[PDB]
Ligand binder design. Structure first.
Ligand SMILES: CC(C)CCC[C@@H](C)[C@H]1CC[C@H]2[C@@H]3CC=C4C[C@@H](OC(=O)CCC(=O)O)CC[C@]4(C)[C@H]3CC[C@]12C
Ligand code: BEF
Ligand SMILES: [Mg+2]
Length: 1032
């Protein structure tokens, strides 16, 4: 149930709300976004539903919808339109206005719709368009750009402004704002580009009363219009009901079925028309018409029934506009960092109190804990990392309007694949022709054009009812595919060879839905007599041939072909004793030519795998990523595609699970059907999955773990399957191209859309090519992005702790680092490094091992502690080595910083730490397995080299920036070379530590604490099934 609350508005109250939400703070905007009821109570006063300009909809979950007007008030909730009915005082959806009208009403609507009625119904129903509104820059900002670390950055900016660091807070604010605005611009431009490649309209012909017609746009279509369908077919603009002629539709975009569907004219009657009862007669929006043929009249008419979001495709894409729910692994890491930073802050407060500095300085340093935990350039570094990942994906043709979900691509353990249009082509392609030699079959010939010039070749070429329209063959889709395969050229009719004799059709018997076959009579120069061909259903066509021409294994071979989802159509022929002339061959009755045939062969049609599918599936199976086929097609085609695709290896068992509906007196039962030709896969249909979910809730986890083929699977069942897999703690990806996959793509963690319609403009990922090559690309980019994010976080931690240790060592001496030294270290070094280190691309190939999913790892913490030990050792060694020199004179301990600068202690500590900030940057930037080698990042190499050169110039060149940076000029060149030597030892030690840890720590962890269990539910289920398989 839902409740609609009305809220009118007043100008003074609106301006008051605006000023109190803008001039006061930005916090009220986010608070109102968290709870819209407070915002609507503050801005809008309660009113009556008949006078409301606003509705609050809870279904509780609260949505605020404005009440638009066209004296026709309405509102749009998740796409659906709810007009305000003025006689019953409610907002009734427009979907309910055509309810109850019968088939006679639909047939009376075949004379078009008058213009005045057209405008009335366009006001009522709106445009015939599935339009998803663009997210504005504020909403895009909140959902994408902001991070919880920007709150820390805002607090630190407030702290800086409190302690009067204007040229530092301003620079940090500029960097963060530029990163945020550039990311918003990139995401907005990608969304606009996605929505510019979707064609929301066509030029459709509509009947108009009075015998006239008019070519209107596809958006002017309203329920009641009578479309005139073109004979060449094309995409369907809306949901209609055939009232004249019949169509041949390819509904693979809505249902996933690859076999073309024959839609027939709606039958006249008093019963109410229903899109489910009369689905055999309805044309659905988004489906492709392959052939529109009319018996009576010169046009194929289809009365429009639903337009816009009330269509089937509109209903499918409307269910994903419902809002439903990345940093939790990093907040634990920053809390672990905060423990160390708090210990250091306690030490700093104690050692500053011993120095008797003002208490305000002490409390400012205490509050500096937040800046220590979250560095100033951490949010900017993360935003730039996501920007680099998004740009790298876009340069490959993949649109990512949710850059925060790129890291989820590196966590994927399972990928669900649609079959029709994603793994295979949309329709049926010619598998081959099976000739006959003597009395028995011959091996299948994949290319019928390679056949000799015999009866079978001419039967494949000429036995059809094709026509020429705009220099292209127009007719039955299977006939089109057969003639394309045979290579012959269409020009009663004449056919020229692909490069023999051009045979000419002398007569043609039309294809009938009762006889399930068609016949032609052809002749060619140099022949003794005409030759009549027959093409149709193999079972009944073979019933016309001679018993000595049909092989004894005909039924077995037909069963073998039709058990794999193939569309077999038989061909037959017979020499005709008729004279080769049109005076007699045009008067031949069908019954004489249909009898005493000779089976020439079979023509196998199959749903063809795309060439880019098998390598990708084998690649995913090599890296131990589960491949699951989630299709709306039948079980035989799905199983055949899985077996020939790589999801099921030829040596791996496949089990069909068949759930029986519980009838009266019996309960639901599961029976498993093992077939011939993870080593144990499960195949099951949609109804079987639905019965297993509700009647066998304990066996559902085992089905989900072992199942690999899910056929006849409804869109709601697809998204339910994705959700159930995610309940097993899977990270489920999904690749789809149809409207049936929208719910699965939205519910999945990484949903890549191959669609060219409005389903793509709201998907996280959208590939520009119609293959699944994007899936390995997305996974590689996700692994690279996860590795880069972990490297950035580790570098920020190492930086913060290095600077904190340096500052503590200086505080113990009653010294500080220095304002301009702080500015150099942060802005010039760490901001540059964090920006340019996120630029390294993904590795060329996928790997078996995934990147770690948590920042609190024994490897990560151990590496951080060892690098900190090395850094602290180097800095303290430099300090205690400066303290043992003849030229060294101690600082003036009486005065405090920054007045005791320049001195030797600060100079040495800054000299060592500045090199450490680059060493710890080159160290955490790891390449393989998940990233390219470091040296491929030319900007980052150049930045590191230039900064190292600058720091070596500071160390060695006498008088270079020793004044600005408040450094002290050292005259002992031996000490300068010894400091450089300490820097080199730190460099080699950091790299050796990283290599030794990365190569020997997992082995040490395995040997010390043997992890004999896992917490992921699917892994425990896999262990349990390995110990005891569920189907014995
Ligand atoms: C207050 C005064 C006296 C101090 C001046 C300090 C500047 C030298 C700092 C401030 C911000 C720093 C910048 C911070 C960010 C970057 C990003 C980086 O450029 C890119 O990000 C391009 C990325 C690509 O190659 O695609 C180059 C270094 C740079 C400009 C830094 C160069 C040094 C800058 C200009
Ligand atoms: F397009 Be899929 F087979 F649902
Ligand atoms: Mg599809």
């Amino acid at each position: 149930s839902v409740r609609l609350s009305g809220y009118c508005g007043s100008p003074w109250r609106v301006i008051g709300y605006h000023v109190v939400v803008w001039m006061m703070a930005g916090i009220p905007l986010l608070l109102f976004r968290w709870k819209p009821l407070w915002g609507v109570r503050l801005r809008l006063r309660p009113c009556n539903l008949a006078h409301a300009e606003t509705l609050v909809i809870e279904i509780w979950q609260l949505f605020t919808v404005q009440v638009q007007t066209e004296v026709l008030r309405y509102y749009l909730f998740q796409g659906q339109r709810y007009i305000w009915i003025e006689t019953q005082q409610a907002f009734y959806q427009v979907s309910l206005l055509d309810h109850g009208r019968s088939c006679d009403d639909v047939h009376r609507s075949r004379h078009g719709l008058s213009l005045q009625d057209q405008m009335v119904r366009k006001a009522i129903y709106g445009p015939n368009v599935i339009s998803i509104p663009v997210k504005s820059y504020p909403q895009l900002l909140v959902d994408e750009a902001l991070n919880p670390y920007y709150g820390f950055q805002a607090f630190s900016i407030a702290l800086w402004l409190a302690d009067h660091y204007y040229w530092y807070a301003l620079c940090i604010f500029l960097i963060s704002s530029i990163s945020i605005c550039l990311s918003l611009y990139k995401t907005r431009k990608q969304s606009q580009t996605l929505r510019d490649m979707v064609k929301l309209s066509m030029r459709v012909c509509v009947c108009r009363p009075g015998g006239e017609e008019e070519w209107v746009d596809s958006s002017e279509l309203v329920p009641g219009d009578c479309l005139v369908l073109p004979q060449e077919g094309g995409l369907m603009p809306c949901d209609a009901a055939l009232v004249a002629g019949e169509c041949m539709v390819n509904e693979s975009s809505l249902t996933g079925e690859s076999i073309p569907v024959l839609k027939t004219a709606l039958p006249e009657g008093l019963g109410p028309y229903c899109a489910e009862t009369h689905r055999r007669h309805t044309l659905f929006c988004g489906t492709l018409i392959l052939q529109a043929r009319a018996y009576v009249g010169p046009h194929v008419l289809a009365v429009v029934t639903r337009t816009g979001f009330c269509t089937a495709k509109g209903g499918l894409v409307s269910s994903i506009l419902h809002p439903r729910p990345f940093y939790k692994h990093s907040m634990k890491f920053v809390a672990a960092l905060s423990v160390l930073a708090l210990l250091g802050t306690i030490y700093s407060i104690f050692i500053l109190y011993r120095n008797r500095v003002p208490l305000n300085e002490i409390v400012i340093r205490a509050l500096d804990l937040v800046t220590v935990v979250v560095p100033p350039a951490l949010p900017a570094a993360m935003t730039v990392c996501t920007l680099y990942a998004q740009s790298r994906l876009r340069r490959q043709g993949i649109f990512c309007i949710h850059p925060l979900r790129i890291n989820l691509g590196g966590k994927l353990q399972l990928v669900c694949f649609d079959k029709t249009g994603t793994l295979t082509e949309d329709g049926l392609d010619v598998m081959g022709v099976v000739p006959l030699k003597g009395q028995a079959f011959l091996p299948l010939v994949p290319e019928p054009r390679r056949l000799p010039v015999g009866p079978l070749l001419r039967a494949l070429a000429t036995c059809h009812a094709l026509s020429r329209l705009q220099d292209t063959p127009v007719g039955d889709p299977m006939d089109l595919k057969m003639v394309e395969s045979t290579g012959w050229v269409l020009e009663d009719s004449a056919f020229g060879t692909q490069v023999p004799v051009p045979v000419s059709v002398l007569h043609r018997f039309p294809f009938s839905s009762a006889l399930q076959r068609m016949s032609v009579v052809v002749a060619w120069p140099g022949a003794t007599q005409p030759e009549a061909y027959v093409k149709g259903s193999p079972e009944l066509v073979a019933g016309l041939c001679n018993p000595e021409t049909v092989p004894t294994d005909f039924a077995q071979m037909l069963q073998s072909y039709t058990a794999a989802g193939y569309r077999v159509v038989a061909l037959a022929s017979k020499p005709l004793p008729t004279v080769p002339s049109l005076e007699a061959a045009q008067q031949l009755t069908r019954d004489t030519v249909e009898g005493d045939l000779s089976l020439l062969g079979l023509l196998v049609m199959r749903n063809l795998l795309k060439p880019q599918t098998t390598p990708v599936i084998q690649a995913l199976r090599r890296t131990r990523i589960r491949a699951v086929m989630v299709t709306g097609d039948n079980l035989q085609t799905a199983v055949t595609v899985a077996r020939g695709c790589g999801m099921v290896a030829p040596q791996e068992h496949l089990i069909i699970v068949h759930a029986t509906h519980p009838e009266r007196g019996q309960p639901a039962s599961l029976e498993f059907l093992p077939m011939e030709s993870r080593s144990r896969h499960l195949a099951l249909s949609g109804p079987t999955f639905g019965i297993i979910v509700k009647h066998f809730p304990k066996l559902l986890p085992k089905v989900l773990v072992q199942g690999t083929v899910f056929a006849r699977m409804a869109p709601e069942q697809k998204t339910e399957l994705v959700c159930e897999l995610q309940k097993l703690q899977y990270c489920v990806g999904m690749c789809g191209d149809g409207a049936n996959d929208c719910g699965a793509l939205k519910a999945a963690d990484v949903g890549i859309s191959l669609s060219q319609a409005e389903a793509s403009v709201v998907s996280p990922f959208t590939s520009s090519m119609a293959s699944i090559e994007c899936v390995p690309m997305v996974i590689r980019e996700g692994r690279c992005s996860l590795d880069t994010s972990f490297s950035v976080f580790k570098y920020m931690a190492l930086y913060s702790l290095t600077q904190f240790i340096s500052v503590l060592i200086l505080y113990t001496i009653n010294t500080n680092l220095g304002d301009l030294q702080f500015l150099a270290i942060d802005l010039v070094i760490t901001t540059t490094v964090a920006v340019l280190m996120s630029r390294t691309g993904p590795a060329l190939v996928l790997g078996r091992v995934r990147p770690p999913g948590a920042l609190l790892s024994v490897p990560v913490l151990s590496s951080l502690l060892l690098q900190m030990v090395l850094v602290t050792g180097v800095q303290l060694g430099g300090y205690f080595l400066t303290l043992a020199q003849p030229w060294f004179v101690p600082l003036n301990r009486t005065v405090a910083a920054p007045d005791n600068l320049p001195n030797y202690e600060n100079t040495v500590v800054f000299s060592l730490s500045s090199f450490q900030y680059l060493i710890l940057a080159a160290a955490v930037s790891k390449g393989a397995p998940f990233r390219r080698p470091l040296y491929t990042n030319v900007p980052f190499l150049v930045a590191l080299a230039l900064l190292s050169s600058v720091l070596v110039g500071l160390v060695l060149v006498p008088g270079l920036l020793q004044g600005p940076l408040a450094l002290r000029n050292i005259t002992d060149t031996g000490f300068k070379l010894l400091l450089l030597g300490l820097v080199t030892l730190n460099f080699v030690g950091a790299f050796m530590l990283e290599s030794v840890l990365d190569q020997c720590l997992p082995a040490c962890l395995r040997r010390l604490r043997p992890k004999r269990a896992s917490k992921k539910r699917f892994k425990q289920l896999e262990r349990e099934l390995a110990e005891q398989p569920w189907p014995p």
